[PDB]
Design an enzyme around this catalytic site. Structure first.
Site, PDB file in Angstrom:
ATOM      1  N   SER A  59       0.848  -1.198   0.000  1.00 13.45           N
ATOM      2  CA  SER A  59       0.000   0.000   0.000  1.00 13.45           C
ATOM      3  C   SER A  59       0.881   1.244   0.000  1.00 13.45           C
ATOM      4  CB  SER A  59      -0.982  -0.112   1.168  1.00 13.45           C
ATOM      5  OG  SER A  59      -1.648   1.118   1.391  1.00 13.45           O
ATOM      6  N   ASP A  91      -8.305  -4.314  -7.070  1.00 15.94           N
ATOM      7  CA  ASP A  91      -7.937  -3.557  -5.881  1.00 15.94           C
ATOM      8  C   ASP A  91      -9.046  -2.574  -5.528  1.00 15.94           C
ATOM      9  OD1 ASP A  91      -6.626  -1.772  -3.974  1.00 15.94           O
ATOM     10  OD2 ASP A  91      -4.741  -2.656  -4.659  1.00 15.94           O
ATOM     11  N   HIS A 112      -7.237  -6.024  -2.295  1.00 20.22           N
ATOM     12  CA  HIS A 112      -6.063  -5.292  -1.838  1.00 20.22           C
ATOM     13  C   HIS A 112      -5.240  -6.126  -0.862  1.00 20.22           C
ATOM     14  CE1 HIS A 112      -3.604  -1.774  -1.015  1.00 20.22           C
ATOM     15  NE2 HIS A 112      -3.777  -1.981   0.279  1.00 20.22           N
TER      16      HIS A 112
END
Length: 317
Positions: free
Chosen positions: A106, A188, A225
């Site tokens: 991230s 995502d 994600h």
């Protein structure tokens, strides 16, 4: 071209930045085969990798080391990068002046490339970068109703078109600086756009090893994600990038038979369940974490690369 010259000065004292670095079973000044793990937005180091790459990298022979910039990666991304640059310098010397790998998730990938862009001293100390779902271009997905109460400083800077993402692009930061592998997915739900398998994607770095899961696994492959970091597919790709003599994941090391979006097979049953709850601290941070009403100002080293964008002080120029 990239920024050159001396490293910019840290805004935090070294004791503060040293306080944010921890190695599993070793001191930062005397560590064997370290790996720097950089967590994602709204979490600390242990929260991002306890269930996945802290045990997985330790099984591969590395000493898991990580940074936990306060508070939970929600503060100014420029300040979070000070923790990483200081940690690399410490771990480089701490392992006998040897290069070390960096593995991120991230915002961690955005932090890694930001440091390599503006802090030239660490370019000769990182041998490779394994970024999972990095947001080099930020994200076009607004926060779950984060428009009437503001957002965390790092959330401002991870918005598409921010002054930070603008400055990283304009400084040449969308081209790889060390051997870089980017593992991301079109599914995502936090970082978008990712659906082009091209430089349009937020995780794409020119000359990097950009692995979109749908390009390897098929157009109907789904991996979210959190799965982009913890999946068996992500382990196969990441393990390839760490083992490779070129510093990038090798297409011969993974295939369609490795397309498993569930947590890595080598994880224990407790770790797989814990890996599924990866974003639980992130969810709490976006709804109940610190918030501010403007994007943080750019530091002097990065300010010239985002003329026209508005931060807390106003328009850059």
């Amino acid at each position: 071209a990239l920024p050159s010259g001396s490293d910019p000065a840290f805004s935090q004292p070294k004791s503060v930045l040293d306080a944010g670095l921890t190695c599993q079973g070793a001191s930062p000044s005397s560590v064997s085969k370290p790996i720097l793990l950089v967590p994602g937005t709204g979490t600390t180091g242990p929260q991002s990798f306890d269930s996945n790459w802290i045990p997985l990298s330790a099984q591969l022979g590395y000493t898991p080391c990580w940074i936990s910039p306060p508070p939970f990666m929600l503060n100014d991304t420029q300040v979070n990068t000070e923790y990483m640059v200081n940690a690399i310098t410490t771990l480089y010397a701490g392992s006998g002046n040897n290069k070390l790998p960096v593995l991120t998730v991230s915002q961690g990938g955005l932090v890694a490339q930001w440091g390599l862009t503006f802090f030239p001293s660490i370019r000769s100390k990182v041998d490779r970068l394994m970024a999972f779902a990095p947001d080099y271009k930020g994200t076009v997905l607004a926060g779950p109703l984060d428009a009437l109460a503001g957002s965390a400083p790092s959330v401002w800077q991870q918005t598409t078109g921010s002054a930070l993402t603008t400055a990283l692009r304009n400084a040449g930061g969308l081209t790889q600086i060390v051997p870089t592998t980017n593992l991301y997915s079109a599914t995502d739900e936090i970082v978008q756009p990712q659906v082009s398998n091209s430089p349009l994607d937020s995780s794409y770095l020119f000359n990097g090893k950009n692995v979109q899961a749908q390009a390897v696994c098929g157009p109907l492959f789904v991996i979210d994600h959190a799965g982009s970091l913890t999946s068996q597919f992500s382990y196969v790709v990441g393990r390839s990038a760490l083992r490779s003599t070129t510093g990038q994941a090798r297409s011969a090391d993974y295939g369609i038979t490795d397309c498993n979006p569930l947590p890595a097979n080598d994880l224990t049953p407790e770790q797989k369940v814990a890996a599924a709850a990866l974003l639980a601290p992130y969810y709490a941070a976006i709804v109940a974490g610190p918030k501010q009403n403007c994007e943080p100002d750019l530091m002097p080293y990065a300010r010239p690369f985002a003329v026209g964008k508005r931060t807390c002080s106003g328009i850059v120029t």
